[PDB]
Amino acid sequence: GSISLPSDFEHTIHVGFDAVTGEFTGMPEQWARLLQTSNITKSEQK
Amino acid sequence: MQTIKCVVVGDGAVGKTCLLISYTTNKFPSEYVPTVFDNYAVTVMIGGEPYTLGLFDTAGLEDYDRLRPLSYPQTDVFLVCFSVVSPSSFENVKEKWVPEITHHCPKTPFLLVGTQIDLRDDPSTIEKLAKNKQKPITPETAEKLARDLKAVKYVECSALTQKGLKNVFDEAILAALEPPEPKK
Ligand SMILES: Nc1nc2c(ncn2[C@@H]2O[C@H](COP(=O)(O)OP(=O)(O)NP(=O)(O)O)[C@@H](O)[C@H]2O)c(=O)[nH]1
Ligand SMILES: [Mg+2]
To answer: Where does GTP bind (chain B)?
Structure first.
């Protein structure tokens, strides 16, 4: 056995269009923080 | 132990979410939303060596020029896909999406993809397909085009059915494998 096809798979961060400020939503913790910081406006209310 | 993150550029089945969806996890999309990034989980064992890959979706122009540093062109090989039957997208994706390959990876290889065996149905397509002298594009035709442009080479079919995705994965993970050298 050499190459094997992936088994696992799960939609971790689903980025979408954000009219709020011509930006995206649900921005990944890294993506968001990279430029912005809040995945969705204010990340999330823990 | 080295990371593998293939970047994608384009729309209408570009290999980003379309591939992993069926070509990998099989399961189809869930929440319909402009895949600006979308994350995924996978582990390809090359020669018996677990790994952590992820299809990094992107564009390279529409609000991505700023969100590019997050994808880092050096991430790995480029994953691109394009319709098969519908030729209106074939030519386009070529001189339309390829140009972007440099926007996100001006010095990084790019892998093209063409699958659409279940989408086929529109008759008008064939009628025109005869005008382009391309004929009913198939899972093989896509490869031919890739040969002309010269790339990492790929081979695969459309969702639902499976002809042999393990192959394209061997070349998709091999090119990025980057045989580590004994450097101290
Ligand atoms: N097995 C396999 N299926 C493929 C391949 N390329 C595309 N497909 C399938 O053909 C379909 C075309 O892509 P599409 O569904 O438009 O994916 P998308 O571009 O992510 N759009 P959306 O964001 O709405 O889900 C996909 O559902 C995908 O499962 C491939 O190389 N292999
Ligand atoms: Mg998608």
So the answer is: 10-17, 57-61, 115-118
